[PDB]
Amino acid sequence: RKLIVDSVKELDSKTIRAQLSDYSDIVTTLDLAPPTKKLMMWKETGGVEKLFSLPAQPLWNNRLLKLFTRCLT
Amino acid sequence: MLFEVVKMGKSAMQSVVDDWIESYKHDRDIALLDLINFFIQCSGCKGVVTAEMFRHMQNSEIIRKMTEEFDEDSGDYPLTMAGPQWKKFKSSFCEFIGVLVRQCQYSIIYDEYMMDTVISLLTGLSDSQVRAFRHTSTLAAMKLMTALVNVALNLSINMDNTQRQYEAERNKANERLELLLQKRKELQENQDEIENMMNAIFKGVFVHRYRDAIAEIRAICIEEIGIWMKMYSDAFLNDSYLKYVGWTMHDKQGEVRLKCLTALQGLYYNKELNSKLELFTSRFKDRIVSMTLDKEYDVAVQAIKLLTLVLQSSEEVLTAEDCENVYHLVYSAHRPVAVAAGEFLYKKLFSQGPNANLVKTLVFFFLESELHEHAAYLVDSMWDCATELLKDWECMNSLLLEEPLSALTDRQESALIEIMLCTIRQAAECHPPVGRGTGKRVLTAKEKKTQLDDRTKITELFAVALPQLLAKYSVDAEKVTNLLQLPQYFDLEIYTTGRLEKHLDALLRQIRNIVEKHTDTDVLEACSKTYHALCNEEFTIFNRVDISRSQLIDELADKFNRLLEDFLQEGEEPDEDDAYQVLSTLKRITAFHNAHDLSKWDLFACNYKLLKTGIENGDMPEQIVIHALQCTHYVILWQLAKISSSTKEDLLRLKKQMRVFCQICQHYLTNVNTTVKEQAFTILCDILMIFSHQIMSGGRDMLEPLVYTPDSSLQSELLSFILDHVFIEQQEDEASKIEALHKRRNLLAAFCKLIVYTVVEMNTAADIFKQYMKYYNDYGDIIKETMSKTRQIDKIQCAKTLILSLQQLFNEMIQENGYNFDRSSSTFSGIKELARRFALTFLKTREAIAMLHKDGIEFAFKEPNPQGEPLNLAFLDILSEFSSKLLRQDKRTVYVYLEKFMTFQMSLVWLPLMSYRNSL
Amino acid sequence: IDVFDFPDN
Helix, strand or coil: CCCCECCCCECCHHHHHHHHHCCCCCECCCCECCCCHHHHHHHHCCHHHHHHCCCCCCCCCHHHHHHHHHCCC | CHHHHHHCCCCCHHHHHHHHHHHHHHCHHHHHHHHHHHHHHHCCCCCCCCHHHHHHCCHHHHHHHHHHCCCCCCCCCHHHCCCHHHHHHHHHHHHHHHHHHHHHCCCCCCCCCCHHHHHHHHHHHCCCCEHHHHHHHHHHHHHHHHHHHHHHHHHHHHHHHHHHHHHHHHCCCHHHHHHHHHHHHHHHHHHHHHHHHHHHHHHHHHHHHCCECCHHHHHHHHHHHHHHHHHCHHHHCCHHHHHHHHCHHHCCCHHHHHHHHHHHHHHHHCCCCCCHHHHHHHHHHHHHHHHHHECCHHHHHHHHHHHHHHHHHCCCCCCCHHHHHHHHHHHECCHHHHHHHHHHHHHHHCCCCCCHHHHHHHHHHHHHCCCCCCCHHHHHHCCCCCHHHHCCHHHHHHHHHCCCCCCCCHHHHHHHHHHHHHHHHHHHCCCCCCCCCCCCCCCCHHHHHHHHHHHHHHHHHHHHHHHHHHHHCCCCHHHHHHHCCHHHHCCCHHHHCCCCHHHHHHHHHHHHHHHCCCCCHHHHHHHHHHHHHHCCCCCCCHHHHHHHHHHHHHHHHHHHHHHHHHHCCCCCCCCHHHHHHHHHHHHHHHHHHCCCCCHHHCCHHHHHHHHHHHHHHCCCCHHHHHHHHHHHHHHHHHHHHHCCCCCCCCHHHHHHHHHHHHHHHHHHCCCCCHHHHHHHHHHHHHHHHHCCHHHHCCCCCCCCCCCCCCCHHHHHHHHHHHHHHCCCCCCCHHHHHHHHHHHHHHHHHHHHHHHHCCCCCHHHHHHHHCCCCCCHHHHHHHHHHHHHHHHCCCHHHHHHHHHHHHHHHHHHHHCCCCCCCCCCCHHHHHHHHHHHHHHCCCCCCCHHHHHHHHHHHHHHCCECCCCCCCECCCHHHHHHHHHCCCCCCHHHHHHHHHHCCCCCCCCCCCHHHHHHHCCC | CCCCCCCCC
């Protein structure tokens, strides 16, 4: 029989008094967005996708970038 | 026949109940039996109840039988199954029961025989360990209870209307009010029969499954207790009911903590003289405030949104730290939390111009909560709340120029500009910053108009005002950099349209004013990208700016040259401040070479002459060499940008430059300066990519003469940089180390650019693969990306480096243990686990795994025991992890290649070898 | 705020 039978139906009086007294495992700390200007740039130019497809030394003019992106598949 | 009607029935729900009540009126029992079997079969129970059962068999007995004849095929019941053809079921099932009661509301739900029966059967299934019965019956029982509340609400109204009917007939025969007071009594009885049923389901079902073990059944009962307290708020908004929500706010499942807040939200948006809520807030305010950082974010949003509804209702209850805590969430990474945090901020603190008071408030707020060094995310958090305030650029512009009426501090100045730039950017390009926008959301036709409108309003307003601002704050470098971003978002068509060419002249004369004064590397990078934006071929002023562009660089090169002939003389020993001079104008040039064709000045000489000094005498400031290599690199990429009609000769002249520069960075990469290697190595990994086999990959067969391939020496000198400066052992809190790792990751990316792309031999990738389970967080994502792309280049030679990594982590062991080490230590166990994760890279994955064993076996005996019966035997309990993915036909194939070295005496301290064969 | 306090049971 694959019929779902629950061997325990209710939650006991004690394990609810514990839930009310300790919600610490369901709260967290603040996931800050990039705090610094540069940490925003390196989040956009991070990860494998943008890393493997962009130079190490940043190229500002588009014609210089193309030389680096011409040599990629 | 009733069950399938509710599932596959597109027929209206009120029609089914009425046709059902016709069957009930004709004979009650035959109608009840199919209503029971309706519920039994709503749970997925493929059984059926007979007439002898309902005549004699008890409720507990009937539930026992239906679990025998349940005849399920899986563990799924209707309410769990997926697809819209089943959420049409959850809806049809709920609407059937609410409509059923409300139609019976008059004269039938009082026969004290039908409702009585259903509740007794529903209250029974709602206690079966069978989840499908408990879940179904509990959803039913709750939908039936809401119906009874609605019925109870009409008994209240209709009884108040009779009481009005009565007293009017007392103030104005007595047999007409004696007929009324019996009506009032009949209604009183009817309410008592209804209250009983509500009690029978509350105490029978709710007070047990609200704390059920299955989370889906606790979310069922809190949602409905929130509905009761909302719709009959007079009778049900007590504390004896609110308690069951104040407790369930602490539940450990997210789905439940949501269904509490949203139910509580219903109680505050009404906001109709909440007075019982004042007590319930007192006790649970601290928990609700905590929930704005709930581990699940949907909860956090609704916790914030709820606190705003608490603010509007009272505003007296939220202390100070409570509110301040919600304010910080505007900097959160999850945008839904952030926008609803800023809704709570605007509602709480915002209520030379009208907005002049408000913009000071924002500034002061941005300065007080020092979590962010910049306002990009602060602005997006409130882009939805206060959009007419963030776009009042006249108000900010006057507050920076127009002197006070009746002041402003340097810090608030350097903050107001930051907020002004962010609003301008989010206005021009209509999308939130990185880490907030969901995707590349296409712009609405209404939004494109709102986008082109302020884009011009920005260009029109600041084209005049920008030079004034750049003239009053020209000295603070931190300020001008923000203020030399405004052109990126201009619409340059409006400088020619409308007498404004005068103002661009005031701008350019102001720009070249600050580049004559500053040395900060971030100011000139913005000056350079300004000139690169104003020098556009489309627009009507390419010429008027190319003048100042070439006019300025003239003044630069004329200086730079004169500074070199005195700084690079044999006799004079130049000094500290003479070096400051050459660095200043060097920085001034380097940042301009990156975004501007400056081969028309041919700067290769002075840098090549400068570099030759630094490596020769070994006494050159780091900032000059760093800026030299850069400026150099920028001349080679600019010449290469102009190459067939373009003079087919000077090609080899560019190769000599490229070739000698490559040798320059080879001697500089070996320097003791950490920063100087960083820029040398970086320029190498970018150069070796451009002048590589791929320079003719697509088209351009003509650019083939230019031929560079790295030395066997330059390769090992590049990899040794990765080992000493990226794989280090494991200044300002966490804001700096993430900046450091994001630098170290950009380096390992530029070298793994070379490996995938055949710029260096692939066997180098073994000193990096061996770190995949050491630096999984730090550099793991790059390794498994370079490794999976190499497998898709050379399926077999990868297996020859994957093992070279395992081979080099084996003599990495004995190098600081000895050949007698424990072959089960967590050090060894990790290499054993690294092998399991390596064999999972494997369709053509057959010829590779063969040669991998062969390179493993031929190494395991590669040195014999100089004293004894061997060496390197242990490498085979490592290699055993690969034999799983090997083929059933290769049990033979490789064992004789194994027997090429295993003798008859060995197959007779040796555990490693016995496990290897045991995998075949 | 005694109704809110969970009972001993």
